[PDB]
Short mmCIF file of C-alpha atoms in Angstrom, two decimals:
data_model
loop_
_atom_site.label_atom_id
_atom_site.label_comp_id
_atom_site.label_asym_id
_atom_site.label_seq_id
_atom_site.Cartn_x
_atom_site.Cartn_y
_atom_site.Cartn_z
CA UNK A 413 10.96 30.21 4.62
CA UNK A 414 10.37 27.96 7.63
CA UNK A 415 6.99 29.59 8.25
CA UNK A 416 6.07 28.99 4.63
CA UNK A 417 7.09 25.35 4.96
CA UNK A 418 4.90 25.07 8.06
CA UNK A 419 2.00 26.56 6.11
CA UNK A 420 2.58 24.02 3.35
CA UNK A 421 2.65 21.15 5.84
CA UNK A 422 -0.50 22.33 7.58
CA UNK A 423 -2.27 22.92 4.28
CA UNK A 424 -1.22 19.49 3.06
CA UNK A 425 -2.51 17.93 6.26
CA UNK A 426 -5.81 19.73 5.84
CA UNK A 427 -6.07 18.50 2.26
CA UNK A 428 -5.36 14.96 3.40
CA UNK A 429 -8.09 15.21 6.02
CA UNK A 430 -10.43 16.58 3.36
CA UNK A 431 -8.04 16.05 0.44
CA UNK A 432 -6.90 13.65 -2.28
CA UNK A 433 -3.81 11.47 -1.77
CA UNK A 434 -1.73 12.43 -4.83
CA UNK A 435 -1.88 16.23 -4.49
CA UNK A 436 -0.90 15.93 -0.84
CA UNK A 437 1.99 13.70 -1.86
CA UNK A 438 3.17 16.32 -4.37
CA UNK A 439 2.98 19.00 -1.69
CA UNK A 440 5.04 16.78 0.60
CA UNK A 441 7.59 16.37 -2.18
CA UNK A 442 7.98 20.15 -2.51
CA UNK A 443 7.71 20.57 1.23
CA UNK A 444 10.98 19.41 2.79
CA UNK A 445 13.29 22.28 3.78
CA UNK A 446 16.57 22.57 5.67
CA UNK A 447 16.43 21.10 9.19
CA UNK A 448 18.32 23.92 10.87
CA UNK A 449 15.85 26.77 10.51
CA UNK A 450 13.21 24.53 12.08
CA UNK A 451 15.59 23.50 14.85
CA UNK A 452 16.43 27.11 15.70
CA UNK A 453 12.81 28.32 15.66
CA UNK A 454 11.28 25.52 17.75
CA UNK A 455 11.66 21.88 18.81
CA UNK A 456 8.09 20.95 17.80
CA UNK A 457 8.10 21.98 14.13
CA UNK A 458 10.67 19.31 13.29
CA UNK A 459 8.53 16.70 15.01
CA UNK A 460 5.51 17.84 13.02
CA UNK A 461 7.50 17.56 9.80
CA UNK A 462 8.58 14.05 10.77
CA UNK A 463 4.96 13.13 11.44
CA UNK A 464 3.97 14.45 8.02
CA UNK A 465 6.72 12.40 6.41
CA UNK A 466 5.49 9.33 8.26
CA UNK A 467 1.96 9.96 7.03
CA UNK A 468 3.23 10.24 3.46
CA UNK A 469 5.10 6.97 3.88
CA UNK A 470 1.94 5.34 5.21
CA UNK A 471 0.07 6.59 2.15
CA UNK A 472 3.04 5.31 0.17
CA UNK A 473 3.34 1.54 -0.18
CA UNK A 474 6.83 1.58 1.33
CA UNK A 475 6.97 1.92 5.12
CA UNK A 476 10.70 2.57 5.10
CA UNK A 477 10.74 6.37 4.57
CA UNK A 478 8.19 7.00 7.33
CA UNK A 479 9.97 4.65 9.59
CA UNK A 480 13.09 6.98 9.45
CA UNK A 481 11.14 10.29 9.78
CA UNK A 482 9.06 9.00 12.72
CA UNK A 483 12.15 7.68 14.60
CA UNK A 484 13.85 11.09 14.18
CA UNK A 485 10.72 12.80 15.50
CA UNK A 486 10.66 10.13 18.20
CA UNK A 487 13.19 7.53 19.35
CA UNK A 488 12.98 4.17 17.56
CA UNK A 489 14.72 0.80 17.81
CA UNK A 490 17.68 0.79 15.42
CA UNK A 491 18.97 -1.79 12.98
CA UNK A 492 21.34 -3.98 14.99
CA UNK A 493 18.73 -3.54 17.73
CA UNK A 494 20.18 -0.53 19.55
CA UNK A 495 17.84 1.90 21.31
CA UNK A 496 17.29 5.24 19.63
CA UNK A 497 16.62 7.92 22.22
CA UNK A 498 14.89 11.21 21.30
CA UNK A 499 15.38 14.67 22.87
CA UNK A 500 12.83 15.92 25.43
CA UNK A 501 13.31 19.59 24.50
CA UNK A 502 9.96 20.01 22.72
CA UNK A 503 7.03 21.40 24.72
CA UNK A 504 5.08 18.80 26.67
CA UNK A 505 1.91 19.03 24.57
CA UNK A 506 4.14 18.64 21.53
CA UNK A 507 5.80 15.66 23.22
CA UNK A 508 2.40 14.07 23.79
CA UNK A 509 1.65 14.62 20.11
CA UNK A 510 4.98 12.96 19.35
CA UNK A 511 4.05 10.00 21.53
CA UNK A 512 0.79 9.69 19.62
CA UNK A 513 2.84 9.79 16.42
CA UNK A 514 5.06 7.02 17.81
CA UNK A 515 1.97 4.96 18.58
CA UNK A 516 0.86 5.47 14.98
CA UNK A 517 4.34 4.51 13.80
CA UNK A 518 4.20 1.15 15.52
CA UNK A 519 1.93 0.21 12.61
CA UNK A 520 4.63 1.27 10.14
CA UNK A 521 7.30 0.00 12.53
CA UNK A 522 6.04 -3.58 12.73
CA UNK A 523 6.20 -3.81 8.94
CA UNK A 524 9.75 -2.45 8.86
CA UNK A 525 11.30 -5.30 10.87
CA UNK A 526 10.99 -6.82 14.37
CA UNK A 527 9.93 -7.86 16.81
CA UNK A 528 8.23 -7.51 20.19
CA UNK A 529 9.21 -4.08 21.50
CA UNK A 530 7.06 -1.93 23.76
CA UNK A 531 9.66 -1.11 26.32
CA UNK A 532 9.45 2.63 25.61
CA UNK A 533 5.69 2.12 25.50
CA UNK A 534 3.84 1.54 28.78
CA UNK A 535 3.63 -2.11 29.84
CA UNK A 536 0.11 -1.95 31.26
CA UNK A 537 -1.89 -1.17 28.10
CA UNK A 538 -3.11 -4.23 26.19
CA UNK A 539 -4.06 -2.15 23.14
CA UNK A 540 -0.65 -2.43 21.49
CA UNK A 541 0.91 -5.32 23.39
CA UNK A 542 -2.14 -7.45 22.72
CA UNK A 543 -1.85 -6.62 19.02
CA UNK A 544 1.81 -7.63 19.11
CA UNK A 545 0.93 -10.96 20.73
CA UNK A 546 -1.72 -11.71 18.10
CA UNK A 547 0.77 -11.09 15.30
CA UNK A 548 3.19 -13.40 17.12
CA UNK A 549 0.50 -16.08 17.38
CA UNK A 550 0.00 -16.08 13.61
CA UNK A 551 -3.70 -16.78 14.00
CA UNK A 552 -6.20 -14.31 12.52
CA UNK A 553 -9.03 -15.18 14.86
CA UNK A 554 -7.24 -13.23 17.62
CA UNK A 555 -6.22 -10.44 15.17
CA UNK A 556 -9.74 -10.02 13.87
CA UNK A 557 -11.09 -9.79 17.41
CA UNK A 558 -8.46 -7.19 18.28
CA UNK A 559 -9.76 -4.99 15.49
CA UNK A 560 -13.38 -5.69 16.61
CA UNK A 561 -12.76 -4.66 20.22
CA UNK A 562 -10.62 -1.67 19.45
CA UNK A 563 -12.87 -0.51 16.82
CA UNK A 564 -13.07 2.80 18.60
CA UNK A 565 -9.36 3.59 18.20
CA UNK A 566 -9.50 3.04 14.44
CA UNK A 567 -12.48 5.36 13.98
CA UNK A 568 -10.77 8.41 15.49
CA UNK A 569 -13.55 12.69 10.77
CA UNK A 570 -15.90 9.70 10.63
CA UNK A 571 -16.48 10.28 6.92
CA UNK A 572 -12.73 10.73 6.56
CA UNK A 573 -12.40 7.20 7.86
CA UNK A 574 -15.77 5.66 7.01
CA UNK A 575 -14.56 2.14 6.19
CA UNK A 576 -11.40 1.51 8.25
CA UNK A 577 -9.68 0.94 4.91
CA UNK A 578 -5.99 1.09 5.93
CA UNK A 579 -6.20 -1.19 8.96
CA UNK A 580 -7.86 -3.97 6.99
CA UNK A 581 -5.27 -3.72 4.25
CA UNK A 582 -2.49 -3.89 6.83
CA UNK A 583 -4.00 -6.93 8.53
CA UNK A 584 -4.25 -8.83 5.27
CA UNK A 585 -0.53 -8.25 4.65
CA UNK A 586 0.18 -9.30 8.24
CA UNK A 587 -1.63 -12.62 7.85
CA UNK A 588 0.55 -13.63 4.87
CA UNK A 589 3.96 -13.21 6.55
CA UNK A 590 3.90 -16.35 8.75
CA UNK A 591 3.42 -18.79 5.86
CA UNK A 592 6.42 -17.34 4.03
CA UNK A 593 8.32 -17.71 7.30
CA UNK A 594 8.46 -21.48 6.89
CA UNK A 595 9.92 -20.19 3.64
CA UNK A 596 10.30 -23.53 1.88
CA UNK A 597 13.88 -24.80 2.39
CA UNK A 598 12.57 -28.28 1.62
CA UNK A 599 13.34 -29.92 -1.72
CA UNK A 600 10.15 -31.97 -1.64
CA UNK A 601 7.22 -31.59 0.74
CA UNK A 602 4.27 -33.84 1.60
CA UNK A 603 0.95 -32.34 0.52
CA UNK A 604 -0.76 -33.28 3.78
CA UNK A 605 1.64 -31.24 5.91
CA UNK A 606 0.97 -28.23 3.67
CA UNK A 607 -2.78 -28.85 3.88
CA UNK A 608 -2.68 -28.95 7.67
CA UNK A 609 -0.84 -25.66 7.82
CA UNK A 610 -3.03 -23.94 5.07
CA UNK A 611 -6.13 -25.31 6.70
CA UNK A 612 -5.59 -22.81 9.52
CA UNK A 613 -6.11 -20.05 6.97
CA UNK A 614 -9.80 -19.19 6.73
CA UNK A 615 -10.38 -20.49 3.20
CA UNK A 616 -10.34 -24.30 3.05
CA UNK A 617 -9.60 -24.29 -0.68
CA UNK A 618 -6.84 -21.70 -0.35
CA UNK A 619 -3.98 -24.21 -0.31
CA UNK A 620 -4.86 -25.47 -3.79
CA UNK A 621 -5.37 -21.81 -4.45
CA UNK A 622 -3.75 -20.23 -1.39
CA UNK A 623 -0.43 -22.10 -2.04
CA UNK A 624 -0.33 -21.27 -5.80
CA UNK A 625 -1.23 -17.68 -4.95
CA UNK A 626 1.74 -17.49 -2.59
CA UNK A 627 4.01 -18.57 -5.44
CA UNK A 628 2.64 -15.72 -7.56
CA UNK A 629 3.53 -13.31 -4.75
CA UNK A 630 7.03 -14.82 -4.77
CA UNK A 631 7.51 -14.38 -1.02
CA UNK A 632 7.77 -18.16 -0.86
CA UNK A 633 8.78 -20.60 -3.60
CA UNK A 634 6.87 -23.79 -4.40
CA UNK A 635 8.26 -26.55 -6.61
CA UNK A 636 6.21 -29.23 -8.34
CA UNK A 637 2.94 -27.50 -7.49
CA UNK A 638 0.00 -28.58 -9.67
CA UNK A 639 1.94 -31.78 -10.31
CA UNK A 640 0.28 -35.14 -10.93
CA UNK A 641 2.19 -36.43 -7.91
CA UNK A 642 0.74 -33.56 -5.90
CA UNK A 643 3.83 -33.14 -3.75
CA UNK A 644 5.63 -29.78 -3.70
CA UNK A 645 9.34 -29.66 -4.38
CA UNK A 646 11.52 -27.02 -2.67
CA UNK A 647 30.26 -18.06 -4.66
CA UNK A 648 26.98 -16.75 -3.24
CA UNK A 649 27.51 -18.68 0.00
CA UNK A 650 31.03 -17.29 0.31
CA UNK A 651 29.67 -13.75 -0.03
CA UNK A 652 27.18 -14.42 2.76
CA UNK A 653 29.93 -15.73 5.04
CA UNK A 654 32.10 -12.70 4.31
CA UNK A 655 29.16 -10.46 5.19
CA UNK A 656 28.75 -12.15 8.58
CA UNK A 657 32.48 -11.81 9.28
CA UNK A 658 32.16 -8.10 8.54
CA UNK A 659 29.35 -7.69 11.06
CA UNK A 660 31.40 -9.50 13.70
CA UNK A 661 34.32 -7.15 13.08
CA UNK A 662 32.04 -4.13 13.29
CA UNK A 663 30.72 -5.28 16.66
CA UNK A 664 34.29 -5.75 17.89
CA UNK A 665 35.28 -2.29 16.68
CA UNK A 666 32.43 -0.65 18.58
CA UNK A 667 33.52 -2.63 21.64
CA UNK A 668 37.15 -1.55 21.34
CA UNK A 669 36.24 2.07 20.62
CA UNK A 670 33.89 2.02 23.60
CA UNK B 544 -10.38 8.90 -34.99
CA UNK B 545 -11.98 10.85 -32.13
CA UNK B 546 -9.41 9.86 -29.47
CA UNK B 547 -6.48 11.27 -31.46
CA UNK B 548 -8.45 14.42 -32.26
CA UNK B 549 -9.21 15.17 -28.60
CA UNK B 550 -5.78 14.15 -27.32
CA UNK B 551 -4.08 17.51 -27.94
CA UNK B 552 -6.76 19.60 -26.24
CA UNK B 553 -6.97 17.21 -23.27
CA UNK B 554 -3.19 17.23 -22.91
CA UNK B 555 -3.22 21.03 -22.82
CA UNK B 556 -6.04 21.02 -20.27
CA UNK B 557 -4.03 18.67 -18.04
CA UNK B 558 -0.96 20.90 -18.29
CA UNK B 559 -2.74 23.78 -16.58
CA UNK B 560 -5.21 24.71 -13.86
CA UNK B 561 -8.32 24.37 -16.01
CA UNK B 562 -8.13 20.66 -15.16
CA UNK B 563 -9.68 21.69 -11.83
CA UNK B 564 -12.71 23.33 -13.46
CA UNK B 565 -15.70 20.92 -13.59
CA UNK B 566 -17.03 22.82 -16.62
CA UNK B 567 -14.48 20.75 -18.52
CA UNK B 568 -16.05 17.45 -17.48
CA UNK B 569 -18.29 17.21 -20.55
CA UNK B 570 -15.14 17.20 -22.69
CA UNK B 571 -13.22 14.79 -20.44
CA UNK B 572 -16.15 12.34 -20.23
CA UNK B 573 -16.49 12.16 -24.01
CA UNK B 574 -12.74 11.50 -24.01
CA UNK B 575 -13.27 8.55 -21.66
CA UNK B 576 -16.01 7.20 -23.92
CA UNK B 577 -13.61 7.34 -26.87
CA UNK B 578 -10.95 5.48 -24.87
CA UNK B 579 -13.46 2.68 -24.32
CA UNK B 580 -14.71 2.39 -27.90
CA UNK B 581 -11.30 2.70 -29.59
CA UNK B 582 -9.49 0.81 -26.84
CA UNK B 583 -7.28 3.85 -26.30
CA UNK B 584 -6.06 4.98 -22.88
CA UNK B 585 -5.05 8.05 -20.87
CA UNK B 586 -4.56 7.45 -17.14
CA UNK B 587 -3.72 11.07 -16.27
CA UNK B 588 -6.98 12.30 -17.82
CA UNK B 589 -9.00 9.59 -16.06
CA UNK B 590 -7.50 10.41 -12.66
CA UNK B 591 -8.23 14.09 -13.32
CA UNK B 592 -11.86 13.12 -13.94
CA UNK B 593 -12.08 11.15 -10.69
CA UNK B 594 -10.51 14.09 -8.89
CA UNK B 595 -13.09 16.46 -10.36
CA UNK B 596 -15.86 14.13 -9.10
CA UNK B 597 -14.41 13.92 -5.59
CA UNK B 598 -14.07 17.72 -5.41
CA UNK B 599 -17.45 18.43 -7.08
CA UNK B 600 -19.72 15.57 -5.82
CA UNK B 601 -22.79 16.71 -7.77
CA UNK B 602 -20.97 15.85 -11.02
CA UNK B 603 -20.17 12.26 -10.01
CA UNK B 604 -20.97 10.14 -13.06
CA UNK B 605 -21.55 6.44 -12.44
CA UNK B 606 -20.91 5.19 -15.95
CA UNK B 607 -17.75 7.23 -16.53
CA UNK B 608 -16.40 6.21 -13.11
CA UNK B 609 -17.12 2.54 -13.84
CA UNK B 610 -15.42 2.76 -17.25
CA UNK B 611 -12.39 4.47 -15.72
CA UNK B 612 -12.06 1.67 -13.16
CA UNK B 613 -12.58 -1.08 -15.73
CA UNK B 614 -10.01 0.45 -18.09
CA UNK B 615 -7.62 0.77 -15.14
CA UNK B 616 -7.99 -2.97 -14.59
CA UNK B 617 -7.12 -3.61 -18.23
CA UNK B 618 -3.80 -1.95 -17.40
CA UNK B 619 -2.76 -4.39 -14.65
CA UNK B 620 -0.07 -5.29 -13.53
CA UNK B 621 0.38 -1.50 -13.40
CA UNK B 622 -0.80 0.53 -10.39
CA UNK B 623 -3.62 2.22 -12.33
CA UNK B 624 -6.45 0.38 -10.54
CA UNK B 625 -5.01 1.18 -7.09
CA UNK B 626 -4.51 4.86 -7.94
CA UNK B 627 -8.13 5.20 -9.05
CA UNK B 628 -9.29 3.67 -5.76
CA UNK B 629 -7.26 6.36 -3.97
CA UNK B 630 -9.40 8.90 -5.86
CA UNK B 631 -12.83 7.57 -4.81
CA UNK B 632 -14.11 7.97 -1.25
CA UNK B 633 -15.72 5.14 0.71
CA UNK B 634 -19.31 6.29 0.17
CA UNK B 635 -18.94 6.17 -3.61
CA UNK B 636 -16.97 2.90 -3.64
CA UNK B 637 -19.91 1.35 -1.77
CA UNK B 638 -22.45 2.33 -4.41
CA UNK B 639 -23.71 0.11 -7.21
CA UNK B 640 -22.11 -0.73 -9.53
CA UNK B 641 -18.81 0.67 -8.27
CA UNK B 642 -18.91 -1.80 -5.38
CA UNK B 643 -19.38 -4.70 -7.81
CA UNK B 644 -16.59 -3.49 -10.09
CA UNK B 645 -14.15 -3.15 -7.19
CA UNK B 646 -15.10 -6.68 -6.12
CA UNK B 647 -14.26 -7.97 -9.63
CA UNK B 648 -10.99 -6.04 -9.57
CA UNK B 649 -10.22 -7.63 -6.20
CA UNK B 650 -10.56 -11.09 -7.75
CA UNK B 651 -8.07 -10.07 -10.46
CA UNK B 652 -5.61 -8.44 -8.04
CA UNK B 653 -5.64 -11.54 -5.85
CA UNK B 654 -5.26 -13.54 -9.05
CA UNK B 655 -8.36 -15.72 -8.55
CA UNK B 656 -8.92 -16.00 -12.31
CA UNK B 657 -11.49 -18.80 -12.30
CA UNK B 658 -13.53 -16.92 -9.70
CA UNK B 659 -13.19 -13.76 -11.78
CA UNK B 660 -14.63 -15.26 -14.95
CA UNK B 661 -17.38 -16.96 -12.95
CA UNK B 662 -18.38 -13.76 -11.16
CA UNK B 663 -18.11 -11.80 -14.40
CA UNK B 664 -21.61 -11.22 -15.78
CA UNK B 665 -20.43 -11.70 -19.37
CA UNK B 666 -23.51 -9.88 -20.70
CA UNK B 667 -22.88 -6.90 -18.40
CA UNK B 668 -23.92 -3.59 -20.00
CA UNK B 669 -20.82 -1.59 -19.07
CA UNK B 670 -18.56 -4.18 -20.70
CA UNK B 671 -20.15 -3.99 -24.15
CA UNK B 672 -18.67 -0.60 -24.97
CA UNK B 673 -15.23 -1.34 -23.52
CA UNK B 674 -13.45 -2.70 -26.60
CA UNK B 675 -10.96 -5.48 -25.93
CA UNK B 676 -11.74 -5.62 -22.21
CA UNK B 677 -11.76 -9.41 -22.05
CA UNK B 678 -8.53 -9.83 -24.05
CA UNK B 679 -6.77 -7.16 -21.99
CA UNK B 680 -7.62 -9.14 -18.85
CA UNK B 681 -6.14 -12.21 -20.54
CA UNK B 682 -2.88 -10.38 -21.17
CA UNK B 683 -2.58 -9.73 -17.45
CA UNK B 684 -3.36 -13.38 -16.72
CA UNK B 685 -0.67 -14.52 -19.16
CA UNK B 686 1.70 -12.05 -17.49
CA UNK B 687 1.03 -13.77 -14.16
CA UNK B 688 1.21 -17.25 -15.70
CA UNK B 689 4.58 -16.51 -17.30
CA UNK B 690 5.85 -15.63 -13.82
CA UNK B 691 4.24 -18.34 -11.69
CA UNK B 692 4.35 -21.51 -13.80
CA UNK B 693 7.11 -23.63 -15.29
CA UNK B 694 4.64 -26.03 -16.92
CA UNK B 695 0.83 -25.87 -16.97
CA UNK B 696 -2.03 -28.17 -18.01
CA UNK B 697 -3.54 -27.18 -21.36
CA UNK B 698 -7.06 -27.51 -19.94
CA UNK B 699 -6.17 -25.39 -16.90
CA UNK B 700 -4.76 -22.51 -18.94
CA UNK B 701 -7.92 -22.36 -21.09
CA UNK B 702 -10.03 -22.26 -17.93
CA UNK B 703 -7.97 -19.44 -16.43
CA UNK B 704 -8.27 -17.49 -19.68
CA UNK B 705 -12.05 -17.66 -19.54
CA UNK B 706 -12.98 -21.16 -20.72
CA UNK B 707 -11.52 -20.89 -24.22
CA UNK B 708 -11.93 -23.39 -27.06
CA UNK B 709 -8.73 -25.15 -28.05
CA UNK B 710 -8.57 -22.85 -31.07
CA UNK B 711 -8.79 -19.69 -28.94
CA UNK B 712 -6.24 -21.03 -26.46
CA UNK B 713 -3.85 -21.53 -29.39
CA UNK B 714 -4.07 -17.81 -30.09
CA UNK B 715 -2.71 -16.94 -26.65
CA UNK B 716 -0.06 -19.65 -26.60
CA UNK B 717 1.12 -18.31 -29.96
CA UNK B 718 1.16 -14.75 -28.64
CA UNK B 719 3.62 -15.53 -25.82
CA UNK B 720 5.58 -18.28 -27.55
CA UNK B 721 4.31 -21.15 -25.40
CA UNK B 722 4.30 -24.68 -26.84
CA UNK B 723 2.93 -28.05 -25.76
CA UNK B 724 5.49 -30.67 -24.74
CA UNK B 725 4.05 -33.76 -23.04
CA UNK B 726 0.96 -30.55 -22.68
CA UNK B 727 1.72 -26.94 -23.62
CA UNK B 728 5.38 -25.96 -23.46
CA UNK B 729 5.72 -22.77 -21.45
CA UNK B 730 9.23 -22.61 -20.02
CA UNK B 731 39.27 -16.11 -5.09
CA UNK B 732 42.39 -14.10 -4.26
CA UNK B 733 40.28 -11.17 -3.06
CA UNK B 734 38.22 -13.48 -0.85
CA UNK B 735 41.41 -14.83 0.72
CA UNK B 736 42.64 -11.31 1.42
CA UNK B 737 39.30 -10.44 3.01
CA UNK B 738 39.58 -13.42 5.36
CA UNK B 739 43.11 -12.37 6.33
CA UNK B 740 41.86 -8.91 7.29
CA UNK B 741 38.86 -10.29 9.18
CA UNK B 742 41.16 -12.67 11.06
CA UNK B 743 43.57 -9.88 11.96
CA UNK B 744 40.69 -7.75 13.24
CA UNK B 745 39.45 -10.63 15.38
CA UNK B 746 42.92 -11.25 16.81
CA UNK B 747 43.29 -7.57 17.68
#
């Protein structure tokens, strides 16, 4: 049935290239089949399946599922920041395809967690490293320019990607994260400090709007907003502490076992 | 009325493969028209229509597509509007008035309510047949308000709801149970054991 699964995956991919998102998703849902047949038949097929899963995740709002499938197809940085190293068994062309898939995953990968990893990736290229720096900067002007220059990469069929839709959506999410990163933690905040920080965002009026909008998102919490004063206000602990202690013990265990 | 009468047949169509035959568009489009007039709704049927248009481009119908998108918006905060967008390619999204409708939807999604009402050509043709469109939008706005405000200026709420008179505002406050205040009123042993274990582990 492995061949049939491959046919399904290929057909689904074709539909996605010329096909609607939901039907392809349904095909993907049917599609998964035992790992082992694929492993016995060839190294590459599993990688292709992982790539398909990653694509589905990308279509899906969640980047988590795709993050797992892509790492398995290719090595990815693990939670707790340990290197994940993939097998080199698959045929070199297949490996190149896998590398391309990994490059695609970076987009999913950045969303999943952190932070500035390109160690597996070649140092010299500024295509991905530059993008990472721009995200780190937290300023769109550099981000926008990065899309503008590497307009060619996004385009690569033209009808299939007429408008660059996905990249733009991703960038808009990316812009929001830094503001949440201050993440309140202040009981009461001067308006002017908020204005200075929100000013950087392209819309001048966003803070009156941009700040309230952030509250609606719920990523960050604002207190006293819309107030006459105009100044924003901003067992559980034990559980958190216990959690940390657990992590420490885990690290020690791995050390001892090692 | 008509919606309920067509419901059974449409449901049967959607259960099988005939939903992929564009010959059934005439029936599905009349179904969409009935959803608009009676303020009824059927997302599955509407997505099937969009799919038929994407697969059979020559059948693309501007009015039906616009009504499907507008009705999808009336169903926010649900994912309806986003799903419909997934069913329309870039070329068609860029055409009038689909481009304009998506722009309006964008204002709603990003919750810029004042901007929405301002940009909304109140006397827009497509809106006339879509029964309850304006009030449906207000329900979404009140959904957002109930989540993002503790207290809110009476004047501000009326603005966000489309510049309502005090009498109309009262209707919505009443609907969600909001009332004016000063203003409209809107809104051990185990642990010890754990430490002991953790400590022991550390010592080891």
